[PDB]
Amino acid sequence: VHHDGFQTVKATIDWEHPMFKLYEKAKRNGKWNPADIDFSQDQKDFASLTSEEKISALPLVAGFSALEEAVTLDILPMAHALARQGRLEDVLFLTTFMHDEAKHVEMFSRWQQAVGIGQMDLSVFHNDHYKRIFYEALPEAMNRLYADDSPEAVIRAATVYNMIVEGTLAESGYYTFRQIYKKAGLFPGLLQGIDYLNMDEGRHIQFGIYTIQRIVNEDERYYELFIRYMDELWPHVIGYVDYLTELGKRIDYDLLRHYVIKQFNLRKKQISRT
Amino acid sequence: VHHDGFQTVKATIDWEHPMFKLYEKAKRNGKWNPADIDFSQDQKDFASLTSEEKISALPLVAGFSALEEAVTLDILPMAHALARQGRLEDVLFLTTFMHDEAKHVEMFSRWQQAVGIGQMDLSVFHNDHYKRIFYEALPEAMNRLYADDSPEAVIRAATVYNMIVEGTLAESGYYTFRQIYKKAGLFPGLLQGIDYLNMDEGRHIQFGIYTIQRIVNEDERYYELFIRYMDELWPHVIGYVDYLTELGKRIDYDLLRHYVIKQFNLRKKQISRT
Numbered sequence: 407v408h409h410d411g412f413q414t415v416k417a418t419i420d421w422e423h424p425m426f427k428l429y430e431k432a433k434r435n436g437k438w439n440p441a442d443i444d445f446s447q448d449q450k451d452f453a454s455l456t457s458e459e460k461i462s463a464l465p466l467v468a469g470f471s472a473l474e475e476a477v478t479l480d481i482l483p484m485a486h487a488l489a490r491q492g493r494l495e496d497v498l499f500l501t502t503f504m505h506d507e508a509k510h511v512e513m514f515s516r517w518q519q520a521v522g523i524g525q526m527d528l529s530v531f532h533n534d535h536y537k538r539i540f541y542e543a544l545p546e547a548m549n550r551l552y553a554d555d556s557p558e559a560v561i562r563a564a565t566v567y568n569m570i571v572e573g574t575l576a577e578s579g580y581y582t583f584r585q586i587y588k589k590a591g592l593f594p595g596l597l598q599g600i601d602y603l604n605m606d607e608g609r610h611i612q613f614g615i616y617t618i619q620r621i622v623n624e625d626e627r628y629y630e631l632f633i634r635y636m637d638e639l640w641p642h643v644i645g646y647v648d649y650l651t652e653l654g655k656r657i658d659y660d661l662l663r664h665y666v667i668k669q670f671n672l673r674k675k676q677i678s679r680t
Numbered sequence: 681v682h683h684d685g686f687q688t689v690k691a692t693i694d695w696e697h698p699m700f701k702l703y704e705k706a707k708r709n710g711k712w713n714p715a716d717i718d719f720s721q722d723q724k725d726f727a728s729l730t731s732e733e734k735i736s737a738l739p740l741v742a743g744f745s746a747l748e749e750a751v752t753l754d755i756l757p758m759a760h761a762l763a764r765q766g767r768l769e770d771v772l773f774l775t776t777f778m779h780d781e782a783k784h785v786e787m788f789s790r791w792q793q794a795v796g797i798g799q800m801d802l803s804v805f806h807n808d809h810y811k812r813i814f815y816e817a818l819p820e821a822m823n824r825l826y827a828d829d830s831p832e833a834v835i836r837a838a839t840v841y842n843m844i845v846e847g848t849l850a851e852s853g854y855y856t857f858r859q860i861y862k863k864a865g866l867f868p869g870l871l872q873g874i875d876y877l878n879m880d881e882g883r884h885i886q887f888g889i890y891t892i893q894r895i896v897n898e899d900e901r902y903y904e905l906f907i908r909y910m911d912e913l914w915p916h917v918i919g920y921v922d923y924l925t926e927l928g929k930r931i932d933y934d935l936l937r938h939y940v941i942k943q944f945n946l947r948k949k950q951i952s953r954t
């Protein structure tokens with residue numbers, strides 16, 4: 407549908423908007439290029455591993471490559487919804503969000519290619535709980551926004567995408583991969599990529615918090631919705647963790663399991679009822 | 681709707697895809713930041729101008745700020761449509777396209793702010809022909825893609841967006857602004873911005889050509905559609921030029937008018953019937 411006019415013709419960008427400021431920070435801090443990462447030592451590391459050691463790394467990598475590909479595709483309805491609401495500064499920021507996710511997809515796929523597993527179908531490490539989140543609930547919640555951009559719908563989309571997928575699973579995923587391979591001295595190229603990815607994702611979670619809080623600020627009752635949507639997805643979060651834990655047991659899992667519980671609970675505390 | 685699986689889990693990025701290669705080029709060549717441009721001399725230049733000289737610059741700036749804001753918003757349906765078709769490499773490239781347009785919007789709005797016209801409503805310099813293109817036909821053609829991603833619909837969207845708006849009007853707009861203010865020695869910050877913008881837009885037009893040509897390659901009859909959609913918009917293109925020409929006459933317009941005719945015709949020649 408038509409444009410009624412243009413904000414930068416009638417006026418200017420809102421230079422003090424929090425998402426304009428986040429956009430500026432993203433440009434300053436968003437220069438890394440996965441194409442520059444040296445994966446040559448990762449290739450040698452992976453080839454020196456035994457077959458059973460090789461397999462141990464793949465379930466987490468399978469979870470991250472799908473996560474990054476999903477969030478690359480599934481942010482587009484949020485950008486559309488906020489554009490249609492006239493939230494220009496949010497849209498400017500989300501162009502950096504979307505491009506970050508493209509680099510994240512690229513990074514993991516370059517690593518798979520370099521270590522010699524690009525031809526392997528890693529889908530076998532997505533259990534039913536993983537699929538419920540990433541194949542189903544995430545795209546459902548985001549695509550809803552094309553026909554329903556109500557505050558309820560936007561809160562639910564930002565909860566599933568930013569607070570659960572990125573703020574709980576991905577955050578715990580980063581941590582876990584460091585807790586394991588930085589200690590072993592393995593995969594320095596991948597760990598550099600993860601460092602850059604984690605820096606990007608700091609910004610992404612701030613957008614999710616801003617979005618949820620500004621809706622909660624209009625009506626305290628949306629706080630209860632936020633908490634409910636978090637709790638709805640917990641069984642699938644922990645059910646995926648239980649599956650990864652069981653795979654690997656076939657590393658302090660009690661410490662990684664608690665990191666996931668910990669992240670879930672601190673995401674809740676970043677939203678204020680008042 | 682659901683994800684059936686993920687390309688970078690089942691396999692990898694298609695590293696040889698033309699839009700992956702364009703994506704890589706965009707990252708290498710996409711580092712400029714409008715926030716780094718020094719507009720202090722532009723401010724002094726604009727303030728030294730007489731009121732009548734000041735007004736002469738504003739119709740073109742009004743046309744560009746709306747153009748960049750429109751194309752920032754209106755690329756999102758194309759990204760969605762190609763994502764839904766599984767064209768991952770196109771999507772990766774389009775994250776750089778979208779972010780480029782954000783910077784372009786930002787650049788012109790920073791210039792307006794710096795020279796002291798951000799508070800002026802420049803909408804008065806959008807005539808009926810401008811509105812038909814930018815307020816109406818462009819968003820109509822792109823939004824269509826949410827419900828109709830047929831080859832006809834994709835060709836029409838890429839024709840209006842990439843070949844007319846960017847490849848005919850914007851390209852002629854850049855040229856004109858150089859033909860005028862680089863010669864006068866004025867607005868060095870704005871002209872630096874325009875240089876960077878023109879470099880970005882080289883990539884953007886390659887995406888439009890790739891998209892139209894791959895559809896034409898499936899069925900030669902789509903070539904006739906492409907030419908028809910170009911000719912449909914010509915009256916509004918030239919009608920806007922006639923309006924700008926008349927404003928300014930109230931600089932070789934015969935040379936700028938022919939540049940627009942020239943660009944329109946070479947865009948047609950970048951698409952091959954065969």
Ligand SMILES: CCCCCCCC(=O)O
Nearest residue numbers: 469470575578579582662
């Ligand atoms: C100990 C397992 C906890 C890490 C969560 C992994 C998330 C992911 O793989 O995307």
Ligand SMILES: CCCCCCCC(=O)O
Nearest residue numbers: 743744849852853856936
């Ligand atoms: C001589 C006028 C031709 C330049 C076209 C301007 C396009 C624009 O302002 O967006």
Ligand SMILES: [Mn+2]
Nearest residue numbers: 474506507510
């Ligand atoms: Mn990511």
Ligand SMILES: [Mn+2]
Nearest residue numbers: 477572607610
């Ligand atoms: Mn993210």
Ligand SMILES: [Mn+2]
Nearest residue numbers: 534535645646
């Ligand atoms: Mn279960």
Ligand SMILES: [Mn+2]
Nearest residue numbers: 748780781784
């Ligand atoms: Mn542009």
Ligand SMILES: [Mn+2]
Nearest residue numbers: 751846881884
């Ligand atoms: Mn462009």
Ligand SMILES: [Mn+2]
Nearest residue numbers: 808809919920
């Ligand atoms: Mn007319």
